[PDB]
């Protein structure tokens, strides 16, 4: 029968899904908030429109949560070591792709908001650039949804 | 920066590996391995003891060397505009040499306690020969690292006195009080290394 | 693959196995493998087992002008430090037509929930030399892929095996704790030497 | 195999493990240090670098 | 039956929840407190409002506490190893999410407070930015409540 | 019979395909997005043409996804250890080659968009040099599709 | 019954409760003590108001001490492994939470003191920020008291 | 006869042949694209001469592909451990030699392109230097083909 | 009997009570004694008063000496493994608390005398801040005396 | 008879003969190449003379290839560990002596070119200096030819 | 009977002799060469004397070569560990001594050759300083010859 | 009788004594030689006095030589671990002693030369301070001679 330790890699999957996704959403919210704050002195109106980098960093945290809860609700003491390895893979995949999307949304957010203060046309541009970052979190999620449900 | 990224990379990689090993031997129920009892019996008492002697002289001499260059570099530099410095401030050097000398004293004291013992089975080696091997290592690190830290400390405060004594000749005889407090650390290293060493025998 | 030599007492209590078992007298060798592993005739008479002690005794009819017996002697102790009952095979004995020889096996040990396995239990210097002899002897032995378990057996199978083959030998530990100490020194040597510099300018 | 026979690790496995690990660590560091000193090399084209 | 080391991981769980949430809430309180100090020099009226990005750093340490208490009140000698890894998962999952939310609240506080000193309209924007940081501690908590009760 | 650990390398393949491709696409998008945002101040009309480095960094994340999804649909409980290493190799080979392509797109997108805003002649040249970056991800795919199937 | 090495974890609990909280209180006193010293030249009257963050850094080592003495008085020559792990986790929990509170008291108790000499109105807010820093020591203590007595 | 845990080295060969050559071509492309972009501002006519270093980087990835495919086609279940190490040595010998060449071209491509725009006579010198840089990729392929077929 | 290696941990207890206290008192004496020397040229009367931070650092070396003497007088080859661990616990508990106190005494002794040179009213504040640092050596001594006698 | 794993060191000989020599020749070509590019602007006549440093770096790659071929043509399954160690030793001797030679060629090549630009008389001195850099490859080669034929 | 694996240390002896002597001779030649070239712009007639530092750095490579050949001429299949270790010691002894001597000849040669063009009377002194740097490689040789012939 | 590894430690003794004394004498000669070179430009007559810190560095590699030769004569195949580790203790003792003394001779030399040039009274002051450094080499010798003869 299955090894007594088998659930460890499954839990590290549930954990990594949330840890690295909160790190992604944290850097994505820290850089975004920094850019919003430093921009507000010169263009106070743009703070409301310029929240969207933060809101997409939040989506990377939720892409962690969806997998961390899906894995957590899947665990059992009798878990096969193969099933735990799927969950570990799902965890590192969404977790570190969320981290990667967080790095992208962070830098794009900061530069995008500072540029938008100087040129209002940049707004539509940086929204598209953020979408091309947030989709990394989604691709992390797709792979992690697949792996958790095979 | 360059070399410090290498030391960081070696350090973090090593402790990351030791987390993964310490997890994996635990979770896989392999804690019958990692037997620190094998490690601390198979590693010969002779090795611990001679590293202890070698670090007792050497780390003390490293402490005296940083002592001498830290105070010596400033004595010379301040001496350019005040040649008298080379009299009085030689006392910060004499204290650094005394930190080396606490090294040679204890490294000879530990040396004259270590003997061959003609055995290799841990039961035939017996607790005595291990307690000597460990105590002479610890005594060696205790004098060695205490003298390292003492010697850098007297170097720094010796450089202190030497740059003060450039600008006002009345200061040196008073700043020496912190060189007495710096020198106490080397002698406390000695006192503990003596007490560790005092109960050992080999044979 | 040959079946293990079990010892049976209401249930299997000892399991012994080798890929090859061979012996010599006066440095002339014989196979025992085909006389031993999976053989119904194998004379275990005078073998013994107890919850803390075990003795596998194998007797042979044709060898070296004699009836010959090999005893494997094992014990299980409550190792207080680690709390698990560790076992060791402490010695081997050879009994001849009228004389005895002894071998001390040095390293054969593990927690009693596990079997012990090594590539060689042997007296020959080329083969790990686990069979120390404290005095000269006419005999030699070799077990290749030696595997034993004399406690907590569970049917015909061995439990998991604690191999002799650990990552670090004693000699390696001393080699590393020498080298990876003086490499701290050498790295400091190079830390200062690589921090050497020369002036870019000179006086008038 | 029927009896749970061990993974047959050789003697000298400690030796081969440490030879291979310390050689591959040494050669991985010698490559990473060399590659770092070439990657983060100052190319020094000071007559043109400003342009 | 269950192993000697069994409760070790569940204990490192309660520890890691509290420790890493305290690290998160400490970094939050440190950066936010620096930003408040630097702001005070020319906007003393803003202090009693600018403490929000410190109150929220305090809330992340509370999310560490609520998990670490819940784990600690659900350990025993006999623990099933599976329950012990779940509790480790809870411990890392809140703990390092609190470290991430604390990173975001620290940076957003330190930038948002100085930006508000330069421009009083930033303040609602800053609360909106901070909710998308503080919620990372909450996602760590949600997962850690789930794993610790699975 | 195969060992129980056998599926671990294979799933770490699926993870590595998506993780390192997201880290590649992230650096690619972050440096490109900085370039676009900084240059929009001088030549707002060029932001739309300047999206291409972002889009191609996005395509590295697709090469990660493709291999991670192919590994994740090829992986199973019974997987032979040979095929599990082949999947690890496919995962690293697209993953770290997509990381390398991401570095190339990031540096080239930034330097190329900045050069283009100073001098609009560069754009066609930048597209050629971007294809010579983007194709590293496609070589990483070519080798990974072979490895995962032969 | 119990391993003779069993006390090692409980011992490193007692040590770590102290060491990390003394590192926290030392950092807290080094930073805030530098703050007070550099401040005091311009404002010699503020020393006895601004000692408060040094008093709170001093209290961090009391949190470590309370747990360390509680663990030390709970050692015995063959303790059950469960209680030894609890004592380790208790010790790390307060020790590192006290370290975290020490970081927050060190940064805040430095920055708030240089702020206070520029603007004395900051003092009322500074104490509240220091309470949100010091209370991490207390959350450390609460989790360590629960664990060390479970 | 042959052990498992053995096709691993040949797989790390195929992977490293693609990975470290993709890194080589990425540095080669990133530095050359930086030099070309910054150059094109002053000499817009020069790009289609000065693109050569980028192409001399693209070939390094292909030298990786040649070996990577050659290895991945030569992998088999139960491959002799000898052949497996020859495929590892091949894979590294192209992989890291292509990395060496990738630096050698990236550096002399950035400097050679900049210098060529300041003085057009350098172009013949630059392409001659690039032969002596690109041949290091070739020497990795030579030994790798020998090791692959030995 | 005890195991043969039993006395190693207790020897490290002596050899860390003293070594880390010597590190603490050395840094406290070197930082403070630089402070005194550079300060004294501006205020030659203040050496006699300004020794106090040095005396406080010298006391950390006395605390390390006391535990180290107590350990070294309690060591024997016969030492039970329990008491050997208690002696390592005591040795680190004082040794690294002495290091913490010595770091604080060094920073606040230097900043204390540099401030005091300009403003003599700091001297009373400094000794209070020092007592709030040197007592960390005492807290480490209290626990270390307790541990080494349990 | 002779072990499995015995060819591994012989393979790492073939690899290291190449890789480290290619790193030496890459440095030598990169560093001297940037020198030639920067020189050529001021002195267009010197280009075709100034290639000699690059040519001598090319020879270090040749010495690496010569040994790598002489190792790789001397591998077999049954290789006695003695012959395999000799091949590792050979591959490190030329590989790293070629590296040393290459590091020297790069530094003396650049300095020698920049010096020759300002003062043409240096060129004979630059060759004589450079001979003593390239001959280190030859001495590495001699030791590798000797070892690989012991 | 000599153990298997014995020849490795002796081989690493012969290699270390040549490798670390080349590393020293290379650094020595690189710094001396830089000094000759940076000097010879202003006083070109000094070249013929100024090469002597490079010749002394080349002699270290001969000390490496001599020992590496003398070691290799004393390897055999089944070498006894005693002679194999003596060869490792001989190898490092000349090797790293030559490395050290290479730094000294390099730093001396650089500072001294540049000093000599400012002040011709330095040269008769610099030679003596270089004899004290070169003799380290000779002492490294004297020990290495002794060890390799016991 | 002896363990087959036994003669290793004494060999690393002989290596360390020569290598770490050469590393020491090298830095000592490099710092002192740089000092003499930079000094000579203004004060060329002072060189033959200023060689003292150089010859006192060269002497450190004579103390390393004396021990390494003593160890090399003291080695034999039949050496017990006791006689071997004594010779390692000798080797580290003079080795790191000369490596330390050589750093103080270096740094004091490099100051003491410029200090004598700008202030001729310091010449004996340097020599005294160098005698107090060069005796550190003799201490590492005296114990190393004691350990090799024990």
CB-based contacts of A130, cutoff 8 Å, min separation 6: A52, A53, A56, A105, A108, A109, A112
CB C161 within 8 A of CB C115: yes
Compute CA I74 distance to the chain's CA centroid, rounded to the nearest angstrom: 21
Quote the domain boundaries for residue G119. Answer: 1-150
Instruction: Using alpha carbons, list the distances in angstroms from residue G120 to A80, C25, G35, G124.
Output: 63, 98, 15, 9
Tokens found for residue C58 = 């194998």
SS3 state of residue I51: coil
Q: What would you measure as the largest C-alpha separation in chain I, in angstroms?
A: 65
Q: How far, in Å, CA of A140 to CA of B12, rounded?
A: 27
How many Å apart are CA G117 and CA G111, to the nearest integer? 10
How wide is the angle at C-alpha J89 spanned by C-alphas J87 and J91, nearest 5°?
65
Kindly state the helix (H) or strand (E) to which residue C8 belongs, with its residue range: strand C5-9
CA count, 13 A, side-chain hemisphere, E80: 12
Considering only CB atoms, D39 lies closest to which of H96, H103, H111, namely H103
> Which residues from chain B sit within 8 angstroms of residue A5, using beta carbons?
27-29
CA B114, B120, B123 angle in degrees (round to 5)? 100
C8 pairs with which residues across the strands?
Answer: C12
**Which residue in the set H29, H41, H48 is minimally distant from F119, CB to CB?**
H41
Task: Record the tokens describing residue E146, joined without a space.
Answer: 């789930």
Closest partner CB to I47 (pick from B128, B145, B174): B174
CB contact (8 A) between residue B191 and residue I8: no
Evaluated on CA atoms J66, J67, J72, J78, the torsion sign reads positive
Contacts of G95 (CB under 8 A, 6+ apart): G16, G17, G18, G19, G20, G21, G64, G67, G140
Give the largest CA-CA distance in chain B.
70
Interatomic CA distance for residues J21 and J27, integer angstroms: 10
Q: Do C125 and K1 touch (CB under 8 A)?
A: yes
Distance, in Å, from the CA atom of A6 to the CA atom of A10, rounded to the nearest integer, reads: 7
Q: Which residues of C touch K1 (CB under 8 A)?
A: 125-126
- Residue G77, chain C, CB below 8 Å: the answer is no
The distance in angstroms from the start CA to the end CA of chain L is: 21
C110 vs B32, B39, B51: nearest CB: B32
Cα(I139)–Cα(I135) distance, rounded to whole angstroms? 6
CA angle F104/F110/F115 to nearest 5° reads 120
Q: Which of J46, J25, J33, J15 is nearest to J116 (CA)?
A: J46
Classify residue C42 as exposed, middle or buried by CB count within 10 Å of its CB (0-12, 13-18, 19+): middle
The SS3 assignment for C11 reads strand
Strand segments, DSSP code E, in C20-114 are 20-25, 28-31, 48-50, 53-60, 68-78, 85-95, 100-104, 109-111
Which residues, other chains included, contact F10 with Cβ-Cβ below 8 Å and sequence gap of 6+? F71, F74, F75, F79, F83, F84, F85, F87, F88
C-alpha span between L133 and C32 (Å, rounded): 71
Q: Please give the order of strands across the beta sheet that includes C28-31.
A: C28-31, C20-25, C139-144, C120-122
Residue to mutate among H93, H103, H120, with most J CBs inside 10 A, is H93
Q: Are C171 and L81 in contact (CB under 8 A)?
A: no
F93, F103, F125 member nearest H51 (Cβ): F125
Strands C161-163, C115-117: pairing is parallel
User: Could you tell me the sign of the dihedral formed by the alpha carbons of I40, I46, I47, I52, in that order?
Assistant: negative
Selected residue of F2, F125, F141, F149 to mutate for chain H interface (largest H Cβ count, 10 A): F125
CB L129 within 8 A of CB B75: yes
Cα B72 to Cα B68, B157, J8, L44, L109, distances in angstroms: 5, 11, 53, 24, 10
Say how far residue C74 (Cα) sits from the centre of its chain: 12
Q: What is the resolution of this structure in A?
A: 3.7
- Searching chain B, which residue's CA lies closest to the CA of residue I45? B171
CA I111 to chain centre: 19
Distance CA F22, CA A133 (A): 9
At G110 the three-state DSSP class reads: helix
Give the C-alpha separation, B140 to B108, whole Å. 11
DSSP annotation of C85: E
Q: Output the CA angle A23-A25-A27, nearest 5 degrees.
A: 65
DSSP state of C125: G
Torsion angle defined by CA atoms of residues K89, K92, K95 and K97, in that order, rounded to the nearest 10 degrees: -90
Task: Give CA separation, F130 vs A118, C166, E13, G3, H30, in Å.
Answer: 28, 51, 47, 63, 9
Contact, H16 vs F145, CB < 8 A?
Answer: no
Q: CA–CA distance from G23 to each of F110, G33, I87 (Å)?
A: 44, 15, 21
Neighbours of G27 (CB within 10 A): 23
Tokens of F77: 């409980």
Residue from J17, J148, J3 nearest J85 by CA: J148
Backbone gaps in chain H, preceding residues (C–N over 2.5 A):
none
Instruction: Count how many residues are written for chain L.
Output: 150
Tokens of H49: 């001469």
Task: Yes or no: say if K114 and L37 are a contact pair by the CB < 8 Å rule.
Answer: yes
Q: Which residues of K touch D19 (CB under 8 A)?
A: 5, 8
Burial B110-124 (b: 16+ CB within 10 A, else e): bbebbeebeeeebee
**Residue contact G61–I85, C-beta within 8 A:** no
Task: Output phi, psi for L21, to 5 deg.
Answer: -75, -35
Instruction: Return the CA Rg of chain C.
Output: 25
Distance from CA of B20 to the nearest CA of A (A): 12
Q: K56-74: string of b/e by CB count within 10 Å (b at 16+)? A: bbbbbbbbbbbbbbbbbeb
Of the residues D18, D20, D44, D46, the best mutation for testing chain J's interface (the one with the most J CB atoms within 10 Å of its CB) is: D44
Are residues G137 and G21 in contact, defined by beta-carbon separation less than 8 angstroms? yes
Every domain of chain D and the residues it spans: 2-51
- Residue J21 CA to residue H104 CA, distance in Å, equals 13
Taking CA atoms, L108 is separated from B76, H6, H50, L32, in Å, by 8, 58, 53, 8
- Are K101 and K134 in contact, with CB atoms under 8 Å apart? yes
Are G15 and I128 in contact (CB < 8 Å)? Answer: no
Residue whose structure tokens are 């172009």: H123
K5 touches chain D (CB under 8 A): yes
| CA neighbor of E93 nearest in space, from G91, B15, A13 | A13
Query: How many C-beta atoms surround the C-beta of residue A52 within 10 A?
Result: 18
Domain count across chain G: 1
* Torsion angle in degrees (nearest 10) through CA of E86, E89, E93, E95: 110
Least Cα distance to C121 among C65, C70, C170 occurs for C70
Q: At what angle do helices B177-197 and B90-111 cross, to 10 degrees?
A: 0
Partner-chain contact H18 F93, CB within 8 Å: yes
For chain L, the DSSP string reads ---TTTTHHHHHHHHHHHHHHHHHHHHHHHHHHHHHHHHHTT-GGGHHHHTHHHHHHHHHHHHHHHHHHHHHHH--TT--HHHHHHHHHHHHHHHHHHHHHHHHHHHHHHHHHHHHHH-TTHHHHHHHHHHHHHHHHHHHHHHHHHHHH-
Which residue's structure tokens are 């510099």? C197
Locate C108 and state its tokens: 């054969």
């Amino acid at each position: 029968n299955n090894p007594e330790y088998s659930s460890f890699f499954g839990v590290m999957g549930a954990s990594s899904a949330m840890v690295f996704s909160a790190m992604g959403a944290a850097y994505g919210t820290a850089k975004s908030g920094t850019g919003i704050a430093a921009m507000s002195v010169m263009r106070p109106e743009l703070i409301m429109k310029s929240i969207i980098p933060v809101v997409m960093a939040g989506i990377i945290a939720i892409y962690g949560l969806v997998v961390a809860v899906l894995i957590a609700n899947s665990l059992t003491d009798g878990i096969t070591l193969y099933r735990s390895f799927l969950q570990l893979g799902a965890g590192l995949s969404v977790g570190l792709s969320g981290l990667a999307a967080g790095f992208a949304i962070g830098i794009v957010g900061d530069a995008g908001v500072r540029g938008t203060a100087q040129q209002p046309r940049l707004f539509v541009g940086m929204i598209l650039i953020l979408i091309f970052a947030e989709v990394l979190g989604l691709y992390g999620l797709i792979v992690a949804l697949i792996l958790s449900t095979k | 920066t360059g070399l410090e990224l290498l030391y960081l990379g070696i350090f973090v990689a090593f402790w990351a590996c030791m987390i993964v090993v310490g997890i994996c031997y635990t979770i896989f129920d392999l804690g019958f391995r990692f037997d620190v009892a094998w490690f601390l019996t198979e590693t010969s008492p002779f090795m611990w003891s001679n590293l202890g002697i070698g670090l007792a002289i050497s780390l003390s001499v490293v402490g005296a060397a940083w002592g001498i260059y830290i105070t010596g570099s400033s004595i010379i530099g301040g001496g350019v505009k005040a040649p008298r410095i080379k009299t009085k401030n030689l006392v910060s050097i004499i204290f650094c040499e005394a930190v080396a000398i606490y090294g040679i004293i204890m490294a000879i004291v530990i040396s004259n306690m270590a003997e061959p013992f003609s055995a290799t089975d841990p039961k035939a080696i017996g607790h005595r020969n291990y307690h000597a091997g460990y105590s002479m290592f610890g005594a060696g690190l205790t004098v060695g690292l205490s003298n390292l830290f003492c010697g850098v400390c007297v170097g720094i405060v010796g450089s202190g006195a030497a740059l003060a004594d450039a600008q006002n000749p009345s200061l040196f005889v008073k700043i020496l009080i912190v060189e007495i407090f710096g020198s106490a650390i080397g002698l406390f290293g000695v006192i503990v290394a003596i007490l560790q060493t005092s109960r050992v025998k080999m044979g | 693959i040959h079946p293990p030599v079990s010892y049976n007492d209401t249930a299997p209590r000892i399991l012994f196995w080798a890929q090859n078992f061979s012996v010599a007298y006066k440095d002339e060798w014989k196979d025992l493998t085909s006389l031993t592993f999976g053989v119904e005739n194998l004379n275990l008479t005078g073998s013994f087992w107890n919850d803390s002690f075990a003795m596998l005794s194998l007797t042979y009819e044709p060898l070296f002008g004699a009836t010959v017996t090999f005893k494997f002697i094992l014990a299980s102790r409550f190792y207080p430090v680690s709390a698990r009952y560790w076992f060791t095979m402490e010695r081997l004995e050879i009994h001849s037509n009228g004389s005895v020889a002894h071998f001390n096996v040095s390293q054969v040990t593990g927690p009693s929930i596990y079997s012990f396995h090594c590539e060689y239990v042997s007296s020959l210097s080329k083969k790990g030399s686990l069979l120390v002899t404290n005095v000269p002897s006419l005999w030699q032995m070799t077990l290749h892929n030696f595997q034993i378990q004399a406690f907590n057996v569970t049917g015909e199978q061995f439990s998991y095996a604690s191999d002799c083959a650990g990552f670090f030998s004693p000699g390696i530990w001393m080699g590393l704790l020498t080298t990876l100490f003086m490499l701290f020194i050498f790295t400091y040597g190079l830390h200062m030497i690589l921090s050497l510099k020369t002036m870019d300018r000179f006086d008038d | 195999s029927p009896y749970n026979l061990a993974y047959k690790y050789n003697l000298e496995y400690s030796v081969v493990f440490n030879l291979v690990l310390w050689i591959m660590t040494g050669l991985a560091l010698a490559v990473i240090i060399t590659s770092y000193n070439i990657w983060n090399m100052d190319p020094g084209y000071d007559s043109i670098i400003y342009r």
